[PDB]
Design a binder for this molecule. Sequence first.
Ligand SMILES: NS(=O)(=O)c1ccc(CCNC(=O)NCCc2ccc(S(N)(=O)=O)cc2)cc1
Ligand SMILES: NCCc1ccc(S(N)(=O)=O)cc1
Ligand SMILES: [Zn+2]
Length: 259
Amino acid sequence: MSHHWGYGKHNGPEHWHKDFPIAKGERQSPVDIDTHTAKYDPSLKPLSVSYDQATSLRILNNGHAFNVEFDDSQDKAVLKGGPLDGTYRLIQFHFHWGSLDGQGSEHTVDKKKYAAELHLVHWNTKYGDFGKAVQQPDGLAVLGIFLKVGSAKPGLQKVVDVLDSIKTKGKSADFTNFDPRGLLPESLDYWTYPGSLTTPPLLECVTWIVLKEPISVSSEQVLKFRKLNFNGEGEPEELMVDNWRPAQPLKNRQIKASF
Ligand SMILES: NS(=O)(=O)c1ccc(CCNC(=O)NCCc2ccc(S(N)(=O)=O)cc2)cc1
Ligand SMILES: NCCc1ccc(S(N)(=O)=O)cc1
Ligand SMILES: [Zn+2]
């Protein structure tokens, strides 16, 4: 209830360390993915994304992004394989995006920034709940997918269309029967490395799995994201744009490629 971090000049990423000192830790995210330096690891398995029984529930403007929430009280939508040991359940997805099409992703690829990045957040079932999982070094698996501006993504349009009902911080709307499979690219080739949450509390609990193939969305789709507000109703309007943390030092990590 006393958090005041954000993405402005007075409360943005350069300030976070003062309340969340792990911001300067050894495994922070995001990072630049240097594609030449990433090593192909033949021992990596194909990723297994099982989203057929996914149960979406609600979409919320939380003042930083919007989250689409899922029932995670059974193994309904799970991620396994790839670099992972065990079963990770989908709890929510959200995006980060820019004020312009040339920025907005958190991860970069040879310093290239995409217009946005989707994060599908999953927690390791051996830890019993999400709150316990974020306290463990292998507690979360975040599947990251880049968005480039081009052709529309039909499977995104239900999200775009509901955004009028959650314009300001604290607003939510029913968001049942949404299929997250509609947000994936054709290929599940990926990079992986150990990292962190990219927002406070910046906990170092994430296995990052970043897909190589971007999805394409239209100019009009991402334009609608930028009409959301960071502020609550009745407060000065601040457009929800540039809700991305920049790349952090790789330090003593190696990024592995599945391909
Ligand atoms: N099942 S339920 O009862 O409907 C249900 C109950 C609760 C919830 C919200 C979970 N809390 C959450 O997602 N916090 C953000 C932490 C975070 C920060 C940063 C990243 S990031 N940017 O690194 O991916 C990922 C996650 C959802 C659904
Ligand atoms: N200085 C404005 C108030 C304020 C700024 C930044 C943060 S932080 N460290 O959580 O990003 C908290 C409060
Ligand atoms: Zn995120």
